[PDB]
Design a binder for this molecule. Sequence first.
Ligand SMILES: C#CCN(C)Cc1nc([C@]2(O)CN[C@@H](c3nc(-c4ccc(F)cc4)no3)C2)cs1
Length: 330
Amino acid sequence: STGSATTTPIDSLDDAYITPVQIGTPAQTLNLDFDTGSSDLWVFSSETTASEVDGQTIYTPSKSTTAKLLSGATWSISYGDGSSSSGDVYTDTVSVGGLTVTGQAVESAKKVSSSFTEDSTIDGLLGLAFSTLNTVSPTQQKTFFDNAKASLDSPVFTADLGYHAPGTYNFGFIDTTAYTGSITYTAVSTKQGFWEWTSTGYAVGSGTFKSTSIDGIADTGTTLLYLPATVVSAYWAQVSGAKSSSSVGGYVFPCSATLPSFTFGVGSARIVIPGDYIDFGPISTGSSSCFGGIQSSAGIGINIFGDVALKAAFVVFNGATTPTLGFASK
Ligand SMILES: C#CCN(C)Cc1nc([C@]2(O)CN[C@@H](c3nc(-c4ccc(F)cc4)no3)C2)cs1
C-alpha cells in the first residue's frame, strides 16, 4: 500500500504545516501537524476542556462506530518550546492520503497548553519519530508509520515541504519526479528515538564549505534551523546589523537586509537553503527588525534540522531495519 497527502503552511511564515487526516467511521477529518520529532498522534476532541478549545476541529469518538476506548491508557507530552498536552486514548481507523491503519492509537486531549489553544488551525499532532518515544502508559503505542510499515510497498515516508506553498507527505514510495539529481542517504541513530543523523558541515552564502560533524535531528515539527552557536554566529556575522536579542529570544536582523543562503552537508552532497527561507519577517507587525530562521541550539541540547532546512530538500525517512535519511535537492 501507499498514501499521499498534501501538507499546507498554517500561515504566511510557514510556522507549521497541517495535513488532513481521516479518523473514525464515518470519517472525521482533522488537520494535524506531522511531527518527525515526536511519536504521539493526539487530537483535540470532545473531551478537551472547553475553555482550551478555540476554533479547532474536534474528534468525537462517540460518533465513530470503529472507536474503542483503550481502557486505562493515558498520555502526557511536552514539546521543546514548553507546550504540552495530555489525556486518554482510543483506538480507531486512521487514514492519511488513502493509506489506512486500523486500530491506531488516537490520543484524545483532555488538556492542552496555551500555544495549542491559540493555534486554531492545528487540530492535533501526528508523530513520526520512533515509537520508543510514545508517551502512552502503561502500554506504549506505535506511531501511524510504525503501524503502517509492514503493509507499505517500501518501509519509508517522504517529506516534501513547500516554501510559502503546499507540499506533500508520501508513505510507502519515493516519487522520483519530486526531486532533482540523486538522493544522498545518511545513517540514522535511533538511540534517542529521533531521526538523528550527522551533517558533514556547512557554508554561508558563496563561502567555502567548512567540513565539521554536526549531529542533529530531522524534525518536521520544528519551524526553524537550530545549530551550534559557532555556526549560527558565522552565518549572522555576514548580515549587517544582525544581532542576538535577549528580549526577542534569538537572532534578529534588519528587515532591509538581503540574507545569504546557507548550505548544509549530507555526506558528500550539499543542500542549499535560499536566503529567503531564513527570513521570518518582522518580529511584530510594522517592525523593521526581522526574525532569523537560523538560531542557536545552545540550551536546547540538540541540533534541529527543522522546517527551514527540510523545506529546501526532498527528504526520505527510511524506516527499514537499518534506518537512514535521504536528502535530495529539488
Ligand atoms: C528544549 C529541549 C530538549 N528537547 C526536548 C528539544 C526537542 N523538542 C522536540 C519537539 O517537541 C518535537 N518536534 C517539535 C514540535 N513542536 C511542535 C509544536 C509545539 C507547539 C505548538 F503549538 C505546535 C507544534 N510540534 O513538533 C519539537 C524534538 S527535540
